[PDB]
Amino acid sequence: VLSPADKTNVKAAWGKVGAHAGEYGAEALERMFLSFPTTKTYFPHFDLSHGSAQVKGHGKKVADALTNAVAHVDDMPNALSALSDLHAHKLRVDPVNFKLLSHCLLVTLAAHLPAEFTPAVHASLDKFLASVSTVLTSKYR
Amino acid sequence: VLSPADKTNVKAAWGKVGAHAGEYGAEALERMFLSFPTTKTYFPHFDLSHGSAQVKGHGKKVADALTNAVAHVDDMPNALSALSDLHAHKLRVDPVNFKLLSHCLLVTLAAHLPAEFTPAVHASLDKFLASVSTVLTSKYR
Amino acid sequence: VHLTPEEKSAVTALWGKVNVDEVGGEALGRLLVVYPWTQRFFESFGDLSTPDAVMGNPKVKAHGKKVLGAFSDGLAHLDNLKGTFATLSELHCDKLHVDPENFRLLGNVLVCVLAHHFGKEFTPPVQAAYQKVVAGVANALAHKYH
Amino acid sequence: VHLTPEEKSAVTALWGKVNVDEVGGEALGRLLVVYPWTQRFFESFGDLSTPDAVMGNPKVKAHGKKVLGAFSDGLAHLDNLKGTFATLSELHCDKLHVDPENFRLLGNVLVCVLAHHFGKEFTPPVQAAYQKVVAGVANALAHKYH
Ligand code: HEM
Ligand code: HEM
Ligand code: HEM
Ligand code: HEM
Ligand SMILES: COc1ccc(OCc2cccnc2)c(C=O)c1
Numbered sequence: 001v002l003s004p005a006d007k008t009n010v011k012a013a014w015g016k017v018g019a020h021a022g023e024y025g026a027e028a029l030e031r032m033f034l035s036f037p038t039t040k041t042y043f044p045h046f047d048l049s050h051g052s053a054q055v056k057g058h059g060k061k062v063a064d065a066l067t068n069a070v071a072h073v074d075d076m077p078n079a080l081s082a083l084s085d086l087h088a089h090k091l092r093v094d095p096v097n098f099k100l101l102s103h104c105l106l107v108t109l110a111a112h113l114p115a116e117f118t119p120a121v122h123a124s125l126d127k128f129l130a131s132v133s134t135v136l137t138s139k140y141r
Numbered sequence: 142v143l144s145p146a147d148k149t150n151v152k153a154a155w156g157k158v159g160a161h162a163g164e165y166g167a168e169a170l171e172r173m174f175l176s177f178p179t180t181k182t183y184f185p186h187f188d189l190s191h192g193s194a195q196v197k198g199h200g201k202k203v204a205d206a207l208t209n210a211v212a213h214v215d216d217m218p219n220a221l222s223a224l225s226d227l228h229a230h231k232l233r234v235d236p237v238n239f240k241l242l243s244h245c246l247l248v249t250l251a252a253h254l255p256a257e258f259t260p261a262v263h264a265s266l267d268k269f270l271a272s273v274s275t276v277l278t279s280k281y282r
Numbered sequence: 283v284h285l286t287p288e289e290k291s292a293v294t295a296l297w298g299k300v301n302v303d304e305v306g307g308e309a310l311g312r313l314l315v316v317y318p319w320t321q322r323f324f325e326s327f328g329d330l331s332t333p334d335a336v337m338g339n340p341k342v343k344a345h346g347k348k349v350l351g352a353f354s355d356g357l358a359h360l361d362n363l364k365g366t367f368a369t370l371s372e373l374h375c376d377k378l379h380v381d382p383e384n385f386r387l388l389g390n391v392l393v394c395v396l397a398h399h400f401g402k403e404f405t406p407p408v409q410a411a412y413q414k415v416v417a418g419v420a421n422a423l424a425h426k427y428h
Numbered sequence: 429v430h431l432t433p434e435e436k437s438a439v440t441a442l443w444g445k446v447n448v449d450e451v452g453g454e455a456l457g458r459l460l461v462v463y464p465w466t467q468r469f470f471e472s473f474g475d476l477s478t479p480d481a482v483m484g485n486p487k488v489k490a491h492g493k494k495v496l497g498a499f500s501d502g503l504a505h506l507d508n509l510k511g512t513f514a515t516l517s518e519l520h521c522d523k524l525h526v527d528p529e530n531f532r533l534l535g536n537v538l539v540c541v542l543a544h545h546f547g548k549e550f551t552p553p554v555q556a557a558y559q560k561v562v563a564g565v566a567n568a569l570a571h572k573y574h
């Protein structure tokens with residue numbers, strides 16, 4: 001449950017991230033696949049090598065979903081309904097994997113925002129990602 | 142995120158507890174205190190011995206809040222705002238403890254409601270307690 | 283795992299009454315219904331599309347028997363739990379990469395199954411004992427990771 | 429634990445640049461800000477009411493140096509993390525009863541802080557090597573829980 005302050009921080013920080021969203025999503029993905037190899041079993045047909053066009057393209061998709069989540073922060077279940085069915089119902093992603101990606105995204109954010117990744121922004125973004133993760137792993141249809 | 146089916150399962154199952162509320166809430170607490178002694182540190186001035194009048198009264202409060210949560214399942218954050226402030230801000234209960242009590246409540250329901258505790262209802266109840274736990278451990282105030 | 287003398291007898295007494303042909307399937311079955319992502323590990327079992335399909339799936343019931351048997355072994359060697367499960371630990375950790383948290387979930391699902399089956403006989407104290415047992419079993423299976 | 433030669437080497441090169449007087453405090457400080465329930469273990473530390481009070485807390489800074497110092501210890505003994513943390517593990521598990529998931533959280537929080545300080549230098553390969561280390565440390569710290 002995001003407080004009014006979390007929502008402000010999330011919109012402000014993601015707004016900061018700005019045009020670099022897709023890039024950050026791809027890097028988060030690369031960081032996850034390297035640091036936690038088991039996560040690769042979910043992407044059997046992807047070229048998961050450093051810089052592959054597939055990971056970068058997929059990263060843009062993740063980032064745009066997050067941007068959409070940020071924009072409908074008050075009714076995420078509704079806005080993420082399709083992706084929730086995809087991840088929770090069809091792929092059966094173990095929730096631990098969402099904690100791994102989330103962590104890799106925060107690591108990625110920290111690496112590119114030495115001036116804006118304050119403790120409060122970190123805390124707010126962590127709750128947002130935890131919220132988005134719970135929505136994507138819950139079958140509410 | 143509870144599906145329409147979860148709400149129906151939770152309302153049907155929890156509804157059968159009824160007047161057994163305090164007793165079942167108290168039994169869940171006792172099961173929790175005996176199975177995971179670390180939980181007892183949250184209740185210092187409490188008489189935790191078997192049959193304790195304090196545990197019995199506390200169990201009725203826990204059970205009634207759950208009834209209230211089931212009533213406002215479609216708007217739990219607002220309904221549980223005060224209880225969330227209590228546990229998240231004032232008591233700072235480590236999130237792990239909620240999983241332990243939740244599990245103890247499922248055990249209690251199962252031991253008393255054999256016909257109602259089907260795999261599907263078991264599932265919805267777990268999801269429901271996890272949702273209540275998330276709200277109670279979140280600071281959205 | 284340290285089970286007092288009294289706990290050991292309560293655990294053995296109860297386990298003596300367990301239907302060894304059903305309790306394992308019930309537990310493995312509920313795990314797949316309650317925590318659906320675990321189905322990903324059992325796609326080869328066939329139809330797991332609904333709660334009833336899972337609970338009535340023959341491969342779920344058969345595999346359930348093996349699982350219960352492993353818990354039984356643990357009960358006969360609470361003294362050497364990590365040793366008893368060394369071979370299963372390599373399978374689940376090095377080969378299947380089942381996240382350790384899932385072992386804890388199955389243990390707890392088993393506990394819900396015993397309560398469901400035994401009702402009031404599965405008292406708070408007997409549960410306290412069983413929690414130690416499944417906690418040890420889960421730790422022994424995760425050992426390879428540590 | 430494992431860590432290949434390149435990994436063990438990279439981890440070292442980076443640790444050499446880590447400020448031992450502040451990174452620990454920042455990691456502990458962020459743990460308290462991001463996961464507020466952790467503040468229940470530091471009531472004697474003083475004002476922790478706002479992120480500014482937390483990140484500025486003298487007790488948080490000082491304690492964080494000891495924390496970092498333990499990580500520095502683990503690095504010098506990657507082949508025996510369990511032994512290295514035996515004393516801390518008894519303190520955290522048996523005395524304080526800190527739930528083990530929190531060890532994992534502080535570990536990842538430290539990784540974020542490292543990324544924050546090193547920027548592009550904290551490459552995915554360097555992170556990967558450091559995730560092996562913090563996971564080793566957390567498992568080592570939770571040993572008395574096994
Ligand atoms: C913040 C978390 C995440 C978000 C916002 C997210 C978002 C997305 C999006 C936008 C897609 C494309 C959907 C489409 O094609 O219509 C997708 C697909 C997918 N996601 Fe995620 N995802 C997240 C986490 C995860 C995690 C943790 C894993 C598991 C390790 C994962 C595994 C997959 C896979 C396997 C696909 C399908 C790939 C393909 O076949 O093209 N996702 N995700
Ligand atoms: C299903 C989740 C839970 C619910 C519905 C719940 C509900 C409540 C309610 C209604 C109160 C009683 C306040 C009053 O007197 O009006 C309360 C107080 C309290 N709860 Fe919880 N609680 C839950 C989980 C937990 C957990 C996991 C812990 C710790 C193991 C915890 C520790 C406490 C404490 C220490 C108090 C104050 C008791 C006193 O000093 O009188 N609660 N809770
Ligand atoms: C917590 C206690 C658990 C016990 C005691 C246990 C026990 C067993 C045993 C006895 C086997 C068969 C070994 C053999 O073939 O020689 C097995 C296999 C296996 N287990 Fe578990 N297990 C546990 C938890 C889990 C969990 C939580 C998962 C994942 C959700 C899992 C997934 C599997 C899979 C995939 C196999 C192979 C089955 C197949 O595909 O044929 N196990 N387990
Ligand atoms: C995971 C890495 C961790 C390491 C390496 C670590 C290391 C340390 C060290 C070296 C000490 C001081 C020991 C002494 O001088 O007696 C200590 C004490 C303590 N740690 Fe940790 N710690 C970790 C995680 C945690 C976590 C997650 C919590 C709580 C959420 C925590 C709570 C405490 C407390 C309460 C004490 C201090 C008690 C006091 O002085 O009042 N630690 N830690
Ligand atoms: C130990 O500290 C407290 C503080 C407030 C309380 O009750 C008032 C309240 C607060 C939040 C939600 N509902 C009721 C209680 C009730 O034991 C205990």
Ligand SMILES: *Cc1cc(OC)ccc1OCc1cccnc1
Nearest residue numbers: 001002076077130131134142275
């Ligand atoms: C608010 C919230 C916090 C956490 O922290 C772990 C996890 C999930 C969550 O919310 C899920 C949600 C979000 C919007 C609407 N319904 C459920």
Ligand SMILES: *Cc1cc(OC)ccc1OCc1cccnc1
Nearest residue numbers: 001138142143217268271272275
């Ligand atoms: C829906 C939901 C599911 C889980 O885990 C199964 C945890 C939390 C959760 O929802 C939290 C919530 C509920 C209502 C409004 N905001 C957040």
